[PDB]
Design a binder for this molecule. Sequence first.
Ligand SMILES: CC(C)CN(C[C@@H](O)[C@H](Cc1cc(F)cc(F)c1)NC(=O)C[C@H]1[C@H]2CO[C@H]3OC[C@@H]1[C@H]3C2)S(=O)(=O)c1ccc2nc(NC3CC3)sc2c1
Ligand SMILES: [Cl-]
Ligand SMILES: [Cl-]
Ligand SMILES: [Cl-]
Ligand SMILES: [Cl-]
Ligand SMILES: [Cl-]
Ligand SMILES: [Cl-]
Ligand code: NA
Lengths: 99, 99
Amino acid sequence: PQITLWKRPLVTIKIGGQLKEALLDTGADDTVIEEMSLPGRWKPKMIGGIGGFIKVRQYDQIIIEIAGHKAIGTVLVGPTPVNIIGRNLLTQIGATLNF
Amino acid sequence: PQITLWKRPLVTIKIGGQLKEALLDTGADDTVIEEMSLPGRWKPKMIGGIGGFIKVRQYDQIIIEIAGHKAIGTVLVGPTPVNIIGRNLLTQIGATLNF
Ligand SMILES: CC(C)CN(C[C@@H](O)[C@H](Cc1cc(F)cc(F)c1)NC(=O)C[C@H]1[C@H]2CO[C@H]3OC[C@@H]1[C@H]3C2)S(=O)(=O)c1ccc2nc(NC3CC3)sc2c1
Ligand SMILES: [Cl-]
Ligand SMILES: [Cl-]
Ligand SMILES: [Cl-]
Ligand SMILES: [Cl-]
Ligand SMILES: [Cl-]
Ligand SMILES: [Cl-]
Ligand code: NA
């Protein structure tokens, strides 16, 4: 698709067999999702933006579908105010910015 | 242009007679710039992101040049760790996300 930016670029994702809403976020290096259960071991990450730092759980090699497009990669889980799809996964779906 | 997302989508802006580096940020509703003087009236605003809220000054009807494209809109000024061009100005330069 070609997504204009008059409204938030919200899409449906699927992770752990469940559908969620998430923001396609070119300003995010990494993908950050609200609290949920994921398989396997996690590693720590302390991450920053406006307002300061959150601690998250890093899960690698997670199957996730974004707007119908299949990706497998790193998902950070923690107290984010919104689910954000960052560049690590936007690159897997072939996304570019264009003007 | 077409901007890939392997790296942060940083561009040069001109604002308030100053050149700055800023992130093209589809996950930002508004444009938020580090501390600087701008002319005219402002009002305070609280904005939230990953780490909680910061206080900013809201300036309306500010001209900006973003990677050579002129726009006008609201600019929020305050203690952001990165200058971010949000959707309010990305729309005006015709930016889309494509995949
Ligand atoms: C600030 C920017 C540089 C980084 N961020 C993305 C940004 O797009 C956020 C998304 C967001 C939307 C929202 F709704 C709430 C929210 F909490 C977060 N947007 C705003 O903060 C903008 C604000 C202000 C502008 O107007 C409105 O729009 C939305 C709000 C609001 C007021 S980040 O989330 O902090 C982030 C993500 C992944 C990540 N990965 C990393 N990896 C490590 C480095 C190796 S560091 C890192 C940081
Ligand atoms: Cl979708
Ligand atoms: Cl990844
Ligand atoms: Cl980078
Ligand atoms: Cl503050
Ligand atoms: Cl505006
Ligand atoms: Cl348009
Ligand atoms: Na003004």
